[PDB]
Amino acid sequence: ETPFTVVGNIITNPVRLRFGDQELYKFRVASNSLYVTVNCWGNLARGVSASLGKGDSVVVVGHLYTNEYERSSVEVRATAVGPDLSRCIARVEKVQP
Amino acid sequence: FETPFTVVGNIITNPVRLRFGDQELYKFRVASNSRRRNSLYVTVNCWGNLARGVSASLGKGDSVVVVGHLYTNEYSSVEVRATAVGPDLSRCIARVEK
Amino acid sequence: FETPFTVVGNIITNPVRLRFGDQELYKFRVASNSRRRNSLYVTVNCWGNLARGVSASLGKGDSVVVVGHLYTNEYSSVEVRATAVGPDLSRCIARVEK
Amino acid sequence: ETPFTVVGNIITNPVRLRFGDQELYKFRVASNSLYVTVNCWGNLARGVSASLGKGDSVVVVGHLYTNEYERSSVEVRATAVGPDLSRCIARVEKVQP
Numbered sequence: 001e002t003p004f005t006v007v008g009n010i011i012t013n014p015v016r017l018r019f020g021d022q023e024l025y026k027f028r029v030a031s032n033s034l035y036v037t038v039n040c041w042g043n044l045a046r047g048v049s050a051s052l053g054k055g056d057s058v059v060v061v062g063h064l065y066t067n068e069y070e071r072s073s074v075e076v077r078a079t080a081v082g083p084d085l086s087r088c089i090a091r092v093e094k095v096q097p
Numbered sequence: 098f099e100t101p102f103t104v105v106g107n108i109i110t111n112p113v114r115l116r117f118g119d120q121e122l123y124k125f126r127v128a129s130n131s132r133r134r135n136s137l138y139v140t141v142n143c144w145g146n147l148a149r150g151v152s153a154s155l156g157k158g159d160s161v162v163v164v165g166h167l168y169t170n171e172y173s174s175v176e177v178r179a180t181a182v183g184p185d186l187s188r189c190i191a192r193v194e195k
Numbered sequence: 196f197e198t199p200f201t202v203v204g205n206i207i208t209n210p211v212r213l214r215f216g217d218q219e220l221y222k223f224r225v226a227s228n229s230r231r232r233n234s235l236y237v238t239v240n241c242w243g244n245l246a247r248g249v250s251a252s253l254g255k256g257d258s259v260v261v262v263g264h265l266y267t268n269e270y271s272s273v274e275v276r277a278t279a280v281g282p283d284l285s286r287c288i289a290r291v292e293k
Numbered sequence: 294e295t296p297f298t299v300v301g302n303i304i305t306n307p308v309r310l311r312f313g314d315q316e317l318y319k320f321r322v323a324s325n326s327l328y329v330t331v332n333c334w335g336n337l338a339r340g341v342s343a344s345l346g347k348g349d350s351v352v353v354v355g356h357l358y359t360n361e362y363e364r365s366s367v368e369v370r371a372t373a374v375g376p377d378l379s380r381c382i383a384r385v386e387k388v389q390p
């Protein structure tokens with residue numbers, strides 16, 4: 001419940017990870033400096049893996065949090081991600097349910 | 098000291114293009130996808146390269162992520178000067194071209 | 196999926212209290228401190244403990260930080276359901292009591 | 294130019310630091326989880342040192358960035374800070390220029 005928006009560029013090769021039913025798509029974003037790891041789940045992990053990659057210019061919206069581990073780092077739980085249409089063009093396709 | 102703003106929702110009008118010598122405006126109305134089991138309507142203004150990307154890529158009904166700065170115009174209407182707009186990839190797919 | 200919002204500026208009206216059985220509303224208008232060498236006007240609504248803190252602490256002219264969620268009401272007016280409000284300590288001092 | 298807002302509590306004893314003409318007032322904030330270091334400068338460092346302390350409930354607005362050093366961590370360059378009047382009361386005093 002700390003909302004957060006970052007506009008920038010994916011700077012790593014995203015990675016998919018599975019947890020049975022569920023899917024995570026993870027990547028790093030740089031802003032224009034801020035470096036943050038973005039985590040997409042579900043249908044968002046889908047849209048993003050199908051559409052974006054390293055070097056793409058991106059708009060990320062979600063919630064910011066700290067993740068402690070064996071250091072502690074700052075990450076986004078994304079709720080919406082899109083390509084930044086100031087820097088590119090997109091063909092949009094809906095996914096039949 | 099501008100007021101930053103983000104809205105996620107859907108374009109709900111047919112966007113309107115306007116040219117001013119060099120410059121281009123593309124503007125449209127956005128409704129936010131709030132849920133109860135509370136709505137937000139705003140006019141978004143895209144300029145420049147952003148106007149171009151958006152007119153080539155999005156239209157009435159499409160899901161959107163809009164980032165920019167919020168303004169009131171007493172002319173009184175609440176408007177966003179967008180800095181980045183994209184389709185919402187939680188609700189769609191995009192084939193990206195530069 | 197509410198739309199979060201933050202505005203920093205000044206209260207520019209005398210706030211208005213309204214009671215509804217248990218509940219209290221304190222509402223007022225805010226202008227944002229934008230600079231040129233572009234304004235934003237919004238109605239802010241505080242409820243509950245926030246209505247109490249704000250009525251005890253702030254009034255017309257005071258500098259404010261407002262955090263909450265943004266709404267349009269077609270009744271059409273743009274309003275904030277505030278979650279946290281405070282004086283802007285870049286422009287003032289506050290002696291805090293709980 | 295990545296804007297950011299956090300509402301929470303100061304959880305360390307703030308510290309003042311000087312650089313000649315200029316003053317920094319630094320403290321840690323927790324949200325309701327996110328931990329972030331907040332940096333106030335100038336008149337903001339003033340208002341905040343004069344008004345707040347460990348345990349106070351706070352509204353922080355500014356810009357988020359990453360700071361690299363001998364690790365890298367996420368910090369806020371605050372532009373406005375106030376006590377959260379949902380959790381307290383305040384007497385406001387203007388500072389004659």
Ligand SMILES: [Ca+2]
Pocket residue numbers: 013014015016
């Ligand atoms: Ca990949």
Ligand SMILES: [Ca+2]
Pocket residue numbers: 306307308309
């Ligand atoms: Ca101290």
